[PDB]
Design a protein around this ligand. Structure first.
Ligand SMILES: Cc1cc2nc3c(=O)[nH]c(=O)nc-3n(C[C@H](O)[C@H](O)[C@H](O)COP(=O)(O)OP(=O)(O)OC[C@H]3O[C@@H](n4cnc5c(N)ncnc54)[C@H](O)[C@@H]3O)c2cc1C
Ligand SMILES: Nc1ncnc2c1ncn2[C@@H]1O[C@H](COP(=O)(O)O)[C@@H](O)[C@H]1O
Lengths: 254, 319
């Protein structure tokens, strides 16, 4: 029994970040990298399945990305993932959600898991696309924005709850194996902030440069830019002066 | 050319984002002669004909599939067949929970352009140019779709304006392709917990987010809200954690605070999904130590200061 958890190491930007000279991305010097928040919940859900089961459940984390990603994969292993896999070649640079979906599927075909978990979206790009793209290339049952999962290893159906807009959920019974995208709040990840990472090349999974990267993506970046955004009226000075202004605003409202 | 719009309904009601998409489609088309085709999918979807017979709809297609409400297999198959039938240049879906279940699958199978959560879209000449966010909404990323004769976009809700008035679309009925879904929908379920206050009715909110740290810190803000005469609400993490009831959660998956005139967001970054619940509030005050937080981009007033220091000083001054 095997659950494969696709994970992304996301980038957050420091203050005063600048756009690259080519105008296609932000300068990497302003990036801080960490595991995508949604992947904490997805990995925890896999681990909850492992712990609830008398039967062995292999939890395998997989990421497509350059060597910086090994730090995040190591941390997943430290939290009890059984195995961790990084797929990369420089030719994959610029691969969008659909191309990453394709790359992931090549690994998944070989691993032949019983369930695949992905996050609902990435905190950086928030495509909310990659996991469901995997499901398409796998031709597997799928559901997005899963806030609850009832599943026992080996079952041919699971019951999920999708988190809908406006404070409702929907129960859905889904054929297994399935791809699920996992929402924040499904569980309470327990480790909240020597076995190596398995390194896989494109060749290892039957792919080449012509299958990946920006040229194969489903849209082309023209530019990335810092837009003009709305500006608040900032209240400076002391805590007392700041609080006094808030109260002037409350009283003005009533 | 044709622009195809996929409407959305749930529990017998049309979701109003449907009409936003119609607005977007009409704004986007290059020529008077271009047509907007709207589709509504469901086993009981004829009921929506009146509500989708609106200004800017040239053709309205009712698609009868096997499920009442959204099913990803039914939707993908149905929208694929609509694209086949209408050969649209552009397909507009809402960036909604439903669309999340299939949009990127639809796009993986064929050679369609694809981008999600788009909030600017225009033609430059014959070139479709869409803009979305990057890096937690810190940049705009502008994309095009070279060579793609069909582009599928998901569209950020509450960005594009609906048109006013009725319309007289040519209405048609099609059956969805006959393939059995690999899931079945069961009960809708109300998010749980208490419901002592309907936060869509209240005019003055103090809202707490992850910035409060430990659950032991909730009580001081509850006190502050009481002393101020505000209703205490929160962002998703606070409610996910069990620290306040889900009935107090503001944003996409929570409630829209429609009656709120004054919203004090404390230790809330201003994710797009939180903003969906409160961006309309006439007076937003943001209290947050990260001047780069998205919340300041919609607040009227900003205070880059520690929420606990502010709360205690506010409490004192109010006394
Ligand atoms: C489909 C879907 C639906 C969603 N629905 C909702 C929803 O309905 N509601 C919702 O809220 N979210 C929703 N989200 C979740 C959303 O993506 C974010 O996770 C969430 O809004 C972040 O909440 P936050 O701002 O409290 O936390 P964070 O983003 O972590 O922000 C915490 C803030 O606190 C500040 N801070 C920390 N310490 C202090 C201090 N001492 N003083 C002052 N400031 C401090 C930080 O600078 C930071 O800006 C949804 C997401 C998805 C994908
Ligand atoms: N490069 C990647 N490697 C592995 N999984 C990924 C990658 N990019 C996205 N994902 C998966 O998709 C989710 C993010 O959704 P998206 O916004 O579509 O990128 C993550 O939580 C992962 O499960």
């Amino acid at each position: 029994m095997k659950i494969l958890v696709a994970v992304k190491q996301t980038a957050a930007l420091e203050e005063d970040f600048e756009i690259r000279e080519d105008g296609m991305d932000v300068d990497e010097d302003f990036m801080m990298y960490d595991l995508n928040e949604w992947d904490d919940f997805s990995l925890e859900e896999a681990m909850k399945i492992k712990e609830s089961s008398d039967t062995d459940v292999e939890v395998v984390v997989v990421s497509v990305g350059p060597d910086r990603v090994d730090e995040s994969l190591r941390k997943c292993l430290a939290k009890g993932a059984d195995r961790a896999v990084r797929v990369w070649d420089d030719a994959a640079e610029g691969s969008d959600a659909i191309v990453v979906g394709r790359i992931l599927t090549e690994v998944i075909k070989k691993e032949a898991p019983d369930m695949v978990f992905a996050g609902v979206q990435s905190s950086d790009q928030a495509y909310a696309s990659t996991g469901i793209s995997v499901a398409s290339y796998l031709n597997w049952p799928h559901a997005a924005v899963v806030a609850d999962l009832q599943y026992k290893p080996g079952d041919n159906k699971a019951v999920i709850r999708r988190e809908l807009e406006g404070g409702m959920l929907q129960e859905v019974e889904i054929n297994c194996p399935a791809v699920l995208t996992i929402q924040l709040g499904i569980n309470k990840p327990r480790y909240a902030s020597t076995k190596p990472i398995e390194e896989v090349s494109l060749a290892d999974i039957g792919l080449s440069a012509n299958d990946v990267g920006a040229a194969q993506s489903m849209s082309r970046v023209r530019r990335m830019y810092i837009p003009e955004k709305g500006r608040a009226t900032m209240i400076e000075g002391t805590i007392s002066e700041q609080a006094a202004k808030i109260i002037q605003i409350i009283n003005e409202f009533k | 050319s044709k622009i195809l719009v996929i409407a959305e309904h749930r529990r017998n009601d049309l979701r109003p984002v449907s009409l936003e998409l119609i607005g977007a489609a009409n704004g986007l088309k290059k020529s008077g002669e271009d047509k907007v085709v709207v589709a509504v999918i469901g086993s009981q979807a004829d009921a929506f004909v009146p509500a989708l017979s609106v200004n800017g709809v040239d053709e309205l297609v009712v698609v009868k599939g096997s499920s009442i409400d959204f099913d990803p297999d039914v939707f993908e198959a149905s929208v694929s067949a609509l694209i086949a039938a209408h050969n649209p240049s552009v397909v507009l879906l809402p960036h909604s929970v439903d669309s999340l279940g299939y949009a990127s699958s639809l796009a993986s199978k064929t050679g369609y352009g694809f981008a999600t959560d788009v909030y600017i879209v225009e033609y430059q000449g014959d070139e479709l140019v869409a803009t979305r966010g990057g890096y937690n909404q810190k940049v705009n990323v502008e994309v095009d779709f070279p060579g793609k004769s069909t582009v599928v976009l998901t569209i950020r809700p509450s960005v594009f304006k609906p048109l006013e008035g009725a319309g007289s679309p040519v209405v048609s009925n099609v059956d969805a392709p006959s393939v059995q879904s690999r899931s079945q929908n069961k009960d809708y379920v109300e998010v749980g917990g208490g419901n002592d206050i309907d936060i869509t009715t209240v005019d003055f909110i103090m809202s707490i987010g992850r910035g409060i740290g430990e659950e032991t810190n909730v009580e001081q803000f509850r006190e502050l809200a009481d002393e101020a005469g505000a209703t205490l609400c929160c962002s998703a993490p606070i409610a996910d954690a069990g620290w306040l009831p889900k009935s107090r959660q503001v944003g996409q998956s929570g409630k829209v605070v429609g009656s709120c005139k004054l919203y004090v967001a404390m230790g809330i970054s201003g994710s797009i999904q939180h903003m969906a619940g409160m961006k309309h509030v006439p007076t937003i005050i943001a209290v947050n130590t990260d001047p780069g937080a998205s919340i300041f981009t919609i607040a009227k007033y900003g205070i880059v200061a520690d929420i606990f220091d502010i709360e205690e000083e506010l409490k004192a001054q109010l006394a």
